[PDB]
Design an enzyme around this catalytic site. Structure first.
Site: not given
Lengths: 4, 215, 222, 222, 215, 215, 222, 4, 215, 222, 215, 4, 4, 4
Positions: C1-2, C141, C180
């Site tokens: 995730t970002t 992440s 991710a």
């Protein structure tokens, strides 16, 4: 109150 | 006699509500319009309850302010627990009726308040706005057209009945409401709208320069 | 995730990817991680998806509840404090793996200068908050790659479109360097979500603009 | 254990197997894992059989109780939220071995287009929920094989019969690749259970139709 | 009859407030000025509630002192929970109104106090000072110019209304207030100011040599 | 005197019941039929208690609404604890009787409500539908044929006793019920059925176009 | 310990052994493990003897208490649910070592066809219950051998006498293959206890009948 | 009481 | 005066019990026979307490229904703590006396109930059945032959006293009970027996075809 | 410790040793381990001396308290249940070293046949109880040896004197094969204690008879 | 007037005690002897409290039955806490006096009971028996010869004082007690003895053929 | 009351 | 009240 | 009240  | 006490409390509540300003809630094309005679700029007799549910009241200020806060707390908790669309005006009106009846029966001083709960249809959906009037003893009535609270109700109610018009525009409904309430100036009036055209939150206050412009 | 956020003259923009994984296995391809809490505030939350959705819902409910009770919205400092309290209340659950790190973007309407009314607030695991002064921030992440790309691309930000393109490119870099984070899916037509906050409020960016920006970036890097 | 669900134009179909084991020993051959929790919703719970039955019973009771008290059924989001809360409350018991993963199939009567009113919702162990928009979902030990079979067979789903056949074939594949899932038992005449939800409500598929479908699949693979 | 009981309680509260010293709160160019008749040096009828919110009272010292402590506790907790700028005078006035009404209805002896909550604008911001008067029964009123509390208020109010001038200087406002309050000496006066020019805390006491220089 | 006080309590409850709308519940071939005179569209005097158990009431709306909610609480909990088929209308009528007696003895104001609990047979089973009438004092009565509640019940009771027909079809029974209740139109009339032919849930509301076609 | 139950046309029969041990040491030779809880139900409990006696006593007390209070006996599903709740509540102590596994046999008086009114319910350690549809069930340390014996012997069941003989022989096999189950003790004259439930109620099989059946089985295997 |  | 309150409560309870149906319990060769006049089929004034202990009552239904439930709860608890054979009718009668006296002294409205507890010998044991009468005031009386409760008890008592025969058969005893109760049909009669010949549970109801054929 | 009990025609006799040790060290030579709980039953508790004394005292108090309150003593089953409840309440203290194992001997006045009115009840660690039908029982560290001796010597029991002799001989064997059990001390004149219960009540056997019996046994084994 | 209420309450207690049967406790050579006029076979007003302590009472059955249970609970707890020989009749008498006084002052209805606690020496020990009489209000009196309770105590006391004899045998003591109580048959009498010759528990009832031969 |  |  |  609303006795009906 | 307990009947004497009950009629005395009823008379007390009626007289307390009588010596109060008048509020009107009427349906118009865009939803529901609340017009109140309120000189104060800080004390508000008209407020939002939930996304499509608005609240008006007449009587002792702190009493219906406490009722307002309780209704807001109930609505937010109910919406969080299940969904925002599971909250309806009928549930809030029933809760208000229950609470007012319990206070009237058990509490030492009965509440001298009259409440009006208004609900409008969701966005992109057609439904006639619902108006519920709640009295001090807990009686709940459904008004399909208009609700008048506080002060002398007979002249304003008759004037509204003569001047009532379905699907009236916002400005025309505002003029009709002001004329019925007169039987006032830009200031010393509180104007709010439950606008069915809004996406999520329908409640919107109309004060100041815009309120003058509509008048 | 970002989730990335950056200020531009006259507002703020906040974007986030769409992938949700459980281990090495991809479980979701269209998750929305950026939410609009109020008319002038947007919040993204990285970490566990369940806890992220729960915090977003609860924070929006709390802000609306205070606004309805008091008749006036909270100041930006009040909103920041409430979010920090919510984050600190979850520390014990965070030690058990149910961690959620928020990033907050807002528009301070009470600020004097309107061109620099955008605000970016970053929270750490202990509940502390810091108002970003460098002009950009990222959580998740892939946050390090995103911030390192924004550091180089931030000189190009001058308006809403340039800021949106820079945010999309930073998300592209984060997805490229980290497995991710999901990149622009041309096959399925799934692109990162974005929210733009300015004087007129907070609005969701339509998917067409983000899609064309992502396609332009992909063609540029080929 | 394996429970599959998939949408077809005009509704949703959800099927489940019949075997329940205790380790490597087969303890039950006629377990029913798919329940009709409401006129337009069905719930299937994978994991411990006891916890599955308890959750099904509690969820049906709670939905019915709200509908009786308030006089109107919950919206689909409300039902999803209640199921997610129930899943979240079991985390303490789930980490002790009493884990349960539910899968919810529904027909949104308030949806705009009847042809796309079917809804599939999948829940994770952390209490989060996700509305499947890619057409199908599966839970249980054989969920991966069933999903990978439906990914190839989903182009043939055009109506109720096609969807039911695809679901039965996916269950057959899951049972073929996983020893904890029971396949069509021709000796005892025990076949997977199914529920079809469309505009007219949710109905249990008769055993004869599923038997015919399973036999056709078996002769096709022979 | 319960009506006679409520009448007697209201008369008792009115008698208690009437036999008390007078307090005047007036708006001037620098903010708000409180002037009270207090011979004692240890008992104080004027105090700060929060950064820009000040408090004055007339009645029984122990009761409005308890109210003052409660309001300070409420303001500090509200400021800690959200922010310092989220605390407003309207919220404190509402809290006093509700708690005074609850005490009047529920407690055996009504509080013979009457309060004034004043709020000024923040530093580097233009906004008219707000004055709220709260009575024993829970009534709340917004006064845009001046508030007079306790004792024979009619002559003092008339003298103020005749002599009150908006945007007056501190010296002129103090002279007008003391002259209207005469209808006193260097001692037996408590003077305080909510000064809008202060950075964070607006409340400031003016006593002793500085008060002598002013007068 | 305590006996005089109890007599006054009973007369107050009787007066409360008297100024109420009348509801009739009659057994027909397919189960039980509830017909009520309810002008309101949001307020309900007919409701479901459990799968084969229905509830009707006459009197103060908030009181029997609270009783309805309590009965639903009891029925759902009892069904969950043991089984759905273990819940019977006899248990609900009994718990209503006990709670009403406790309220009458210990509460300040007696509940001005009169309740009727109706139970039908299960699917694929024959059994004569059972009707219990519960009064404000806690009295319980088993009515073999019909129950009439609220208002002046003597004329409607006489009309029903004259015109009742066992195993009458739904349309004939509805016509007889409306004719007896006249001593009304499609609107302002609430019709509900406990239909023993339904598989699990027997309660069903007959409103709108269907009611107009039937009546 | 070993308790078997099986259905025959028109009723059900339950049988149980008499041995109770503490490790390898024999402590009891005439323990009764099958109890008539109600007029038409019998409950055998395997595991710790103390927990078995306490559970059966408490369950019978609760059933008669409900019947006296409400004036009508519970339906069979109600009894099943109460026993399942009792089993579930003991999970904490079962993990400690005081485990008890019940097997319930009953005659549903409200069943449509009296010929198939017999019911057998088996519970797991997690509290879940299953109504056996294969006709037989067993609990205890020697349950597997008894079940595998009844699987072959159930074709001989035609009435109460044949069912009783099959149950006794299954107990004989379980005791023959397992040292924690006691077989027929001809020296001391101690034989397994049996209960027969049919339309006229539940009765205890007289000791002489079980004795002659056991002697016939022993002479057959000699 | 405050009624306005 | 407190003594005035006590006496008026005494006649209140007597009036309540008097306007109620009558129940008779008589000892015969097989144990104890309870015969009551009860029109309702679901309401029962005669019930089992424990294996060999039976209960009958006359008065307000919900009151002695609560008493019955409390007695069953007490008896079942004692049997589990000690042994089934440790529960006796004497202990239940003493507990009933304690609770009735406590309610009479402390509760606002005394219970207008009259209770009878019957105990028979265990299986394979010879002992004369024991009958206990418990009144509203907490008094308890050991009656060896018969107990008559509710309504005008004098004629029933006189007829039953002169016609009482020890070691009577069940049919003869039922005939005598019906004859004394008349001073009735198959319906509106509740008949139960504590039968000493039963192995564990002595209580048994005789209704329907068996009751019609016996009488 | 070692406590034995055995039935003889017309009553029951229960005997116990006297030694109490702390590890390998002898701390008590005249400990009385058999108490007369009431006129018709005696109780002997092995294990920790302190816990044994407390349980005996509390059990006697509870029996007398019930008899005084209700005016009639408990039935034998009631006394058994109370002792079982007291034992089961001690599991938490038993697991930490405060263990107590009771053995209960009584004479059932309500029993039909007076020749078989004696009753022996043994309790295990988990609180269960078993009415011994073999005619003898033993508890304590040397219980195994005493039981194995009584198994051979029980054919000689025909009355009170022979039963007392057999009990004393069993205690002698237990003390002979186990070092934690005290034998008849001729030097100090300390002999095992005994209680005899018959139709006339429960009486303590005078030390002279036990002394002569022990001397006879010793000279028999010399 | 509190004094008038206290006198009325004392009169009520005296009237309640007076309309009750009489109990006699007298000391004789072997210990203490209780004779009670009780036609009922199940209800006993003579009971054991502890090893050497016996209890007698006269009045309303439920009240002194509760007192009996409380005294037994106290005595057993005291014996377990310290020792059996630490329990004496003096402590029980003091506890009864304190409890009776507290009930008289605090409870709404005082107990209409009259208590007697008797104590004898331990085994192998010589001591004069102790008799303590306790009234409703808490008065405690030590009587060295005999105690008379309930009914008209004047003739009973006169007859005893005329016929009392120290060191009297069992038969003579019983004859004197029954003769004094006459101022009856073997039945309808409860006779018990605290026999100092018993090893541990002194209380023993004498009923049946033993009482027939003894009397 | 009962005073037997 | 309910007496029957 | 036992004043001695």
């Amino acid at each position: 109150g609303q006795y009906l | 006699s307990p009947e004497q006490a009950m009629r005395e409390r009823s008379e007390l509540a009626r007289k307390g509500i009588a010596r109060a300003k008048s509020v009107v809630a009427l349906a118009y094309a865009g939803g529901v319009l609340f017009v109140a005679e309120n000189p104060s700029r800080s004390l508000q007799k008209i407020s939002e309850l939930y996304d499509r549910v608005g609240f008006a009241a007449a009587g002792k200020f702190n009493e219906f302010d406490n009722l307002r806060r309780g209704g807001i707390q109930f609505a937010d908790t109910r919406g969080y627990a299940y969904d925002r669309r599971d909250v309806t005006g009928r549930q809030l009106a029933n809760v208000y009726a229950q609470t007012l009846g319990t206070i009237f029966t058990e509490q030492a001083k009965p509440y001298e308040v009259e409440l009006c709960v208004a609900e409008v249809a969701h966005y992109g959906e057609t439904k006639r706005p619902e108006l519920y009037r709640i009295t001090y003893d807990g009686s709940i009535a459904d008004e399909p057209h208009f609700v008048v609270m506080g002060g002398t109700t007979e002249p304003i109610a008759n004037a509204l009945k003569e001047s009532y018009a379905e699907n009236a525009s916002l400005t025309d409904a505002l003029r009709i409401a002001v004329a019925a309430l007169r039987a006032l100036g830009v200031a010393s009036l509180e104007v709010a709208v439950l606008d069915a055209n809004r996406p999520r939150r329908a409640f919107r206050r109309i004060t100041g320069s815009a309120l003058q412009a509509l008048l | 995730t970002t989730i990335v956020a950056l200020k531009y003259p006259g507002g703020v923009v906040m974007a986030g990817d769409r992938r949700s994984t459980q281990g090495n296995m991809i479980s979701g391809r269209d998750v929305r991680k950026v939410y609009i809490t109020d008319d002038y505030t947007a919040t993204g939350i990285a970490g566990t998806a369940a806890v992220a959705v729960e915090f977003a819902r609860l924070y929006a409910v709390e802000l609306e509840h205070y606004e309805k009770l008091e008749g006036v919205p909270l100041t930006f400092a009040g909103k920041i404090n409430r979010l920090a309290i919510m984050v600190r209340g979850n520390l014990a659950a965070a030690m058990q793996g149910l961690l959620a790190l928020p990033l907050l973007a807002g528009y301070d309407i009470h600020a004097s200068d309107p061109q620099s009314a955008g605000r970016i607030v970053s929270f750490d695991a202990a509940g502390g908050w810091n108002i970003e002064e460098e002009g950009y921030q990222a959580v998740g992440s892939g946050s390090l790659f995103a911030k390192s790309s924004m550091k180089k691309l931030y000189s190009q930000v001058t308006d809403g479109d340039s800021g949106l393109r820079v945010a999309v490119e930073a998300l592209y870099d984060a997805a490229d360097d980290d497995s991710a984070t999901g990149g622009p899916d041309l096959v399925r037509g799934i692109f990162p979500t974005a929210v733009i906050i300015d004087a007129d409020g907070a609005v969701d960016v339509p998917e067409s603009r983000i899609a064309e920006l992502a396609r332009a970036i992909i063609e540029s890097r080929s």
